[PDB]
């Protein structure tokens, strides 16, 4: 019944060797090699909750008088887009749940990629040969941000409408062809007909298709290079040490997959997001104090706040002050996209790297990363500096000046501290290899000298003083519990003491197990050595 389904599926696709190859691929097990999955799962939730969300939504700007589930706002003249978005939360059973799931998933998606990009950056996974992946991923994050932006602008409420007003007036104030380009996008003056239609047709099709295509290409390209991994015992630059796809990797992927799905289902219910009923229909005259776009869009708005009034008047023409903002954001994007190329120009090393490197061993790049993180965080904080100012009792003018000055001295201090801390971590790593683990046994010698017991990880010469082990690019133990010298040697339940008979054998078995593991790992190391000398 099962032997026969495979028989007549192989007899026609000759897939025995093709499938065996896929199910035997080995993947490195590290918690930081999973952060990419979070983005994938959040993306699946978005496109699935999004499709459900389009069965009840009318993206029209046509004004109507509201009569619906929301008893307030009855009799209020609103757009068709706002009225239907207000209907999918008060007239659709479990529609608010799905709407909130969608928005939460959007947030997680952007944070699922940012953190992933940080992992890629710090560990050096963008090096040869993985630069197409870096470029693809960078395009992915920019498009994700753009997608999120046009998503929350669909309801056409008062808060989102101001975002569109800002965006339109940014475009219109571009040198030379910013007037024609603005009229080409919106189809006329803002607001326009066929403005919520072009955005809705590019948020549920153009961007999704592009994103899906890029993602699929991204994953396939990753599966071709079969990942990267940290330096460790037995692992070289021409092998992958981890677990096979089945039965271990596939199940773990599903398990974590549904974990993310379940977590998004919790926030969708217990936590409110984008309460559009309190915001009212878009009106060009009405505005609110907290008009921040969204967390991933805060950096752009923060850039616009800290840019001084630097207009260039050229007779019959004028360059707005916001033009420089555009220039600056353009530079930040260009710096981010073409990083592998700039890093390898100033390092002069392009040597097909398959082994990762710990952030502590690359202080310049790590420090640049933390420098850039502080830059981004300051822009993000400045983007919502009016809610910071009130809630934390700080002058708003002082906040603007903190943003302005902090963008110069914040990055500088971040670099200095991070560099020093990286070297500090390197130094602590060498003390252990040179002298051994600092055990907490302060013995007094007969003469009266207080001495700390040191545990060597290597062979000693004559009288302690271990032969210094060379750095190996891996994590060195720092405590004695990391060698299992604190392991609980009492099998049983919380109440159950467990029979000694079955308790003796199990400790013996585990002892023989980790002995064999260590033996096989060191044999792998030896193999690499005598392989590398030919």
């Amino acid at each position: 019944s099962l032997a026969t389904v495979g028989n007549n599926l192989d007899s026609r696709y000759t897939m025995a060797s093709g499938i065996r190859r896929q199910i035997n691929k080995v993947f490195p097990t590290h918690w930081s090699f999973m952060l990419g999955e979070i983005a994938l799962y959040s993306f699946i939730v978005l496109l699935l909750t999004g499709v459900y969300l389009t069965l009840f939504f009318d993206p029209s700007i046509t004004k109507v008088i509201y009569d619906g589930g929301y008893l307030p706002l009855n009799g209020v003249e609103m757009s068709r887009a706002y009225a239907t978005a207000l209907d999918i939360s008060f007239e659709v059973r479990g529609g608010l749940f799905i709407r909130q799931m969608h928005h939460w998933a959007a947030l997680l998606f952007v944070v699922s990629m940012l953190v992933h990009m940080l992992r890629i950056f710090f560990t050096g996974a963008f090096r040869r040969p993985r630069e197409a992946n870096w470029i693809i991923g960078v395009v992915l994050i920019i498009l994700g941000m753009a997608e999120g932006f046009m998503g929350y602008s669909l309801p056409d409420d008062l808060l989102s409408g101001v975002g569109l007003r800002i965006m339109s007036a940014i475009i219109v104030g571009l040198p030379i062809i910013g007037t024609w380009m603005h009229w080409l996008i919106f189809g006329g003056d803002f607001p326009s007909d066929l403005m919520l239609d072009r955005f809705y047709i590019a948020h549920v099709l153009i961007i999704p298709a592009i994103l899906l295509g890029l993602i699929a290409a991204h994953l396939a390209l990753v599966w071709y290079q079969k990942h990267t991994q940290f330096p460790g015992a037995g692992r070289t630059e021409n092998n992958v040490i981890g677990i096979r796809i089945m039965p271990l990797f596939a199940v773990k992927a599903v398990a974590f997959g549904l974990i993310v799905f379940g977590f998004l289902a919790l926030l969708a219910g217990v936590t409110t997001i984008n309460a559009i009923w309190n915001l009212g229909p878009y009106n060009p005259s009405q505005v609110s104090a907290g008009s921040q776009p969204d967390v991933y869009m805060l950096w752009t708005d923060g850039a616009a706040r800290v840019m001084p009034a630097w207009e260039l008047y050229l007779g019959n023409y004028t360059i707005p002050a916001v033009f420089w903002v555009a220039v600056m954001l353009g530079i930040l994007v260009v710096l981010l996209v073409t990083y592998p190329f700039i890093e390898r120009k100033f390092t002069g090393d392009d040597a097909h790297h398959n082994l990762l490197q710990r952030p502590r061993d690359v202080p310049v790049r790590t420090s640049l990363g933390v420098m850039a993180l502080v830059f981004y965080i300051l822009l993000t904080v400045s983007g919502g500096n009016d809610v910071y100012a009130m809630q934390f009792h700080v002058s708003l003018n002082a906040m603007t000046w903190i943003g302005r000055i902090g963008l110069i001295v914040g990055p500088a201090i971040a670099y200095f501290i991070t560099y020093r801390l990286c070297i500090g971590l390197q130094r602590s790593d060498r003390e252990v290899l040179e002298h051994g683990i600092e055990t907490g046994i302060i013995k007094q010698m007969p003469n009266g000298a207080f001495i700390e017991v040191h545990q060597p990880l290597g062979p000693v010469d004559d009288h302690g003083h271990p032969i210094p082990l060379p750095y190996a690019g891996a994590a060195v133990p720092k405590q004695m519990n990391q060698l299992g010298y604190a392991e609980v040697e009492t099998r049983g339940g919380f109440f159950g003491p467990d029979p000694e008979d079955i308790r003796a054998k199990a400790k013996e078995i585990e002892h023989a197990n980790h002995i064999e593991e260590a033996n096989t790992l060191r044999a792998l190391n030896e193999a690499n050595i005598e392989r590398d000398k030919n």
Binding site: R12, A16, S17, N24, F56, R93, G94, F97, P247
Partner: protein
């Protein structure tokens, strides 16, 4: 546009059958059942993955897992019940001229509510344009789409 694209197409085809050489290529097919070596190698690997997982012996675990997965699936697809609507629940508010929203009512049902319903002849009247100091606008004030009719009309 037809002339441009079609002509380019004709030019390209006319090149391959006049300039590109004449080729007969023979390729060997590798299809049908796979080699037995690999065949018994893929079934042994799958069998190993199932046996070593030790899931076949746990009747309760796999039984509850099936139930849990089914309930999860049903939980995911449950908000699709927001689409479900009762055809026999009248739409909110009193009965209008389009009826009650059900299949029973037809806007003529207003006659049963002591409303005087006429027979309305369609005059197919459209909006009127009005130009003022404040541009041109379409108004439908004086205009009646439906008009009463007489038994001599």
């Amino acid at each position: 546009s037809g002339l441009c694209i079609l002509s380019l197409g004709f030019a390209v085809v006319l090149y391959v059958k006049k300039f590109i050489p004449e080729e007969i290529a023979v390729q060997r097919r590798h299809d049908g059942p796979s080699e037995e070596v690999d065949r018994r190698t893929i079934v042994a690997l799958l069998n190993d993955s199932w046996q070593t997982s030790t899931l076949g012996r746990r009747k309760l675990i796999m039984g509850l897992a099936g139930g849990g997965a089914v309930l999860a699936g049903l939980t995911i697809i449950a908000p699709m019940g927001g689409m479900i609507k009762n055809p026999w629940n009248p739409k909110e508010g009193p009965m209008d001229v389009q009826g009650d929203g059900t299949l029973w009512t037809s806007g003529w049902t207003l006659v049963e509510n002591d409303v005087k319903v006429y027979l309305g002849r369609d005059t197919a009247a459209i909006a009127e344009s009005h130009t003022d100091a404040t541009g041109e606008h379409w108004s439908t004030t004086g205009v009646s789409r439906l008009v009463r009719m007489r038994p001599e009309d």
